[PDB]
């Protein structure tokens, strides 16, 4: 399942351009804040789901750590695209974490996908929307599996 080995290789290389162990955390949450600010403009009713991590102040340490946690999970899924067995278990775990949160709709993940497809070309050299779509959409559906 998921995406092909050549498509995954493109996504992994392009992702590591802008995210790796050597990237400072400030760049991480700058991307994180751009992503979630864009998400709240598409689905404004989803911002309330993040009250527990102080979304009222996206410059706080609590919300900064949230976006760092989110992008680390996205980085984890990307780097395991060529390991379908492990990626299945990884996305099942992420799905259970999101299902148990009352208020999450599957269309919020659809909106997150569009945010990523919009923000990433601004950061990545020669963004490949086809390879990313082939890999990120099964990733999104696997994480959104079970949400209403």
């Amino acid at each position: 399942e998921f995406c092909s080995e050549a498509d995954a290789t493109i996504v992994i290389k392009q992702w590591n351009q802008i995210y790796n162990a050597g990237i400072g955390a400030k760049s991480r949450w700058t991307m994180g804040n751009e992503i979630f600010s864009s998400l709240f403009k598409l689905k404004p009713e989803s911002e309330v789901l993040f009250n527990n991590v102080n979304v009222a102040n996206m410059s706080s340490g609590a919300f900064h750590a949230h976006t760092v946690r989110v992008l680390s999970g996205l980085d984890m899924g990307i780097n395991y695209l060529n390991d379908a067995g492990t990626l299945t278990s990884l996305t099942a775990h992420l799905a259970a974490q999101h299902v148990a949160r009352t208020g999450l709709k599957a269309v919020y993940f659809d909106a997150m996908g569009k945010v990523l497809m919009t923000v990433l070309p601004s950061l990545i050299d020669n963004f490949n929307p086809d390879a990313w779509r082939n890999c990120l959409l099964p990733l999104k559906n696997a994480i959104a599996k079970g949400l209403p």
Binding site: Q17, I18, S27, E34, S122, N126
Partner: protein, 144 residues
């Protein structure tokens, strides 16, 4: 276009690729300034003290080193508005008694852009991000 947070990150990575660690910095700076004086030959007179007549001399190559170092500090500070504006004010005072026109800052802008693209390739060069963020830099050096 605007020099937003995403554009600043992109300009940082592309600059780091083009500027490099030191080996290709001489050729990088030569390509830029050969373009500057070809488009604006009248600008060489401002560089009499650093041998603007001959950009192959060690004297001008050291000036090119200082200019690219100044660009490096600004690019590295694009995500730190407070320190960036302080450094831009320093570059402003370093040019205050020299009468550099706004047209001349745009000439160096285009040369730096051609130099970066020549170093990293037309395939990946982000013209909109570079133009908007260089505008932020030069307008700050112009005391604006």
């Amino acid at each position: 276009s605007e020099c937003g947070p995403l554009q600043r990150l992109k300009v940082k990575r592309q600059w780091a690729e083009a500027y490099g660690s030191g080996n290709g910095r001489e050729e990088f700076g030569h390509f830029i300034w050969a373009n500057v004086f070809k488009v604006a030959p009248s600008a060489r007179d401002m560089f009499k003290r650093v041998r603007g007549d001959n950009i192959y001399t060690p004297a001008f190559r050291a000036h090119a080193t200082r200019v690219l170092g100044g660009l490096d500090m600004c690019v590295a500070l694009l995500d730190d508005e407070s320190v960036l504006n302080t450094q831009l004010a320093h570059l402003a005072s370093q040019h205050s008694s020299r009468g550099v026109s706004a047209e001349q800052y745009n000439v160096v802008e285009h040369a730096v852009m051609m130099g970066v693209e020549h170093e990293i390739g037309q395939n990946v060069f982000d013209k909109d991000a570079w133009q908007a963020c260089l505008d932020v830099i030069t307008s700050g050096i112009q005391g604006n």
